Design a protein around this ligand. Structure first.
Ligand SMILES: Nc1ccc(C(=O)NCC(=O)O)cc1
Length: 494
């Protein structure tokens, strides 16, 4: 086995701490990149460029000047803003909306940019996932840091909308690969009893990145500068990424025992176990890993695994879809986006606390049902309540966000414990893929706000309810042994 060798080198030592810290720092800006559009694509008050200004702008039901209509003659005929729009610079001096007039007839391009970024995220999670099996995790991480820095800066200096969208897609690809491969590298470089802690640290760093986004966006309001400042740190990340030590587990699995010994020797030197490291040798590693040394297409051939795959796909998709639909709408609560983003980042700790309590006490199925159902109801009620109730709608949005984060944690644990070990990792990958698909589709649904203002909220709230209903089909895994083969699945089912 490899666990004994990993323990011998020093376990969680200086190298492990330094590597995990320096490989997990980029997840601080992961959230900034995921939800940058809330600030770089903010929609300020606007009206057509012309008895004064009021005499030219037609009025609406609420009495505000019409956003995209203008009187042909002074005051009755209205025309679109052929002369361009007059935006408000008081709070949002410049965003991609004001830069490229992504308003009214072109207001769906704002959502299409996010959809393309998430399509890039999915594409990266697949392509770089395949590549890391060939070039290793360290090379892929270096390339991802370089790509993210380059694409982010290029988007910050994009001269037109298509270039911005292309570079946002590429940066999403690189960031998705970063997220996928950080956990893999750190898990392969850590013992078996610390991988859950690694995942917990990933969650915490994402929660902290949510705070960081609000802080940075408040500091620098202009969108070009904001994108530049949230994108350039990946240059430093790339610079120090050359010093990473590649996972010895991958080296061994790739049939390079000399490289495995060299990596373990270096880890011993850093961890201070040179004397124990010198004991290791090619013959020892071979005699230890001789023992260690199914496909995703059986998830559909065998009905017993097929049912689980389908249900978990629904669950993952619903969680991601509702989550991103809810969190990409911070400007619709009538409260300052900085405060809302701060509260959204803060609400992630009590959410996971309650989630942990519920899973340990009741089980996984009740936890998943409760999380999804409560998020759906919260979003639906948010849709029903009038927009003039800023405080109540903000509170309900925060509650739904916390519920969706709890659902994310619960679904990860449940899909981990549901599949047999023969096809467990494939199932986890497929579930994450469906989550990425949901994140891709959320902006598409949000594009419908142009016609029906509240339809996006209704769909975002309705999908989790159906997913919670679907959760009732899965079995309970609390206080049960982890299955190892499909025969174990049949035994559990009967
Ligand atoms: N607050 C969170 C948001 C997203 C995720 C996640 O892992 N999504 C899968 C993907 O789309 O890559 C986890 C926590």
């Amino acid at each position: 086995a490899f666990n004994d060798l990993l323990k011998q080198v020093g376990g969680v030592g200086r190298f492990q701490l330094i590597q995990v810290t320096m490989v997990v720092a980029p997840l601080l800006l992961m959230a900034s990149h995921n939800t940058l559009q809330n600030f770089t694509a903010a929609i300020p008050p606007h009206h057509c460029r012309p008895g004064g200004l009021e005499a030219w702008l037609p009025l609406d039901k609420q009495g505000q000047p019409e956003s995209c209509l203008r009187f042909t003659s002074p005051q009755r005929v209205t025309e679109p803003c052929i002369d361009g729009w007059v935006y408000d610079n008081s709070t949002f001096p410049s965003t991609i909306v004001t830069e490229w007039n992504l308003v009214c007839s072109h207001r769906a391009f704002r959502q299409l940019a996010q959809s393309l970024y998430m399509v890039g995220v999915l594409l990266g999670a697949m392509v770089f996932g395949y590549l890391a099996d060939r070039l290793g995790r360290r090379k892929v991480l270096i390339l991802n840091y370089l790509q993210t820095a380059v694409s982010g800066t290029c988007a910050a200096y994009a001269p037109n909308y298509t270039v911005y969208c292309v570079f946002r897609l590429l940066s999403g690809m690189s960031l998705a690969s970063i997220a996928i491969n950080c956990m893999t590298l750190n898990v392969e470089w850590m013992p078996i009893h610390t991988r859950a802690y690694v995942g917990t640290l990933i969650g915490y760093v994402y929660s902290l990145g949510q705070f960081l986004l609000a802080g940075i966006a408040y500091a620098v309001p202009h969108w070009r500068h904001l994108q530049l400042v949230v994108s350039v740190p990946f240059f430093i990340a790339f610079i120090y990424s050359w010093f990473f030590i590649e996972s010895a587990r991958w080296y061994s699995s790739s049939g390079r025992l000399d490289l495995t010994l060299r990596a373990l020797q270096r880890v011993a030197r850093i961890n201070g176990k040179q004397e124990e490291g010198a004991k290791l040798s090619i013959e020892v590693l071979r005699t230890s890993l001789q023992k260690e040394l199914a496909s995703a297409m059986e998830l559909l051939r065998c009905p017993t695994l097929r049912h689980l795959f389908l249900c978990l796909s629904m669950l993952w998709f619903a969680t991601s879809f509702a989550y991103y639909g809810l969190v990409m709408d911070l400007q619709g609560f009538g409260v300052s986006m900085y405060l809302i983003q701060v509260i959204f980042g803060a609400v992630d700790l009590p959410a996971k606390f309650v989630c942990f309590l519920v899973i340990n006490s009741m089980g996984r199925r009740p936890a998943q049902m409760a999380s999804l159902l409560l998020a759906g109801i919260c979003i639906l009620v948010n849709g029903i309540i009038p927009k003039s109730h800023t405080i109540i709608r903000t509170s309900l949005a925060v509650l739904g966000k916390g519920c969706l984060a709890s659902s994310f944690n619960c679904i990860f644990l449940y899909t981990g414990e549901l599949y047999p070990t023969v096809i467990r990792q494939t199932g986890l990958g497929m579930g994450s893929t469906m989550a990425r698909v949901g994140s891709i589709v959320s902006p598409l649904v949000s594009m419908t706000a142009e016609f029906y203002p509240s339809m996006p909220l209704f769909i975002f709230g309705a999908v989790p309810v159906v997913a919670s209903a679907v959760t009732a089909l899965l079995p309970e895994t609390l206080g049960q042994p982890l299955p190892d083969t499909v025969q174990d699945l049949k035994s559990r089912s009967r």
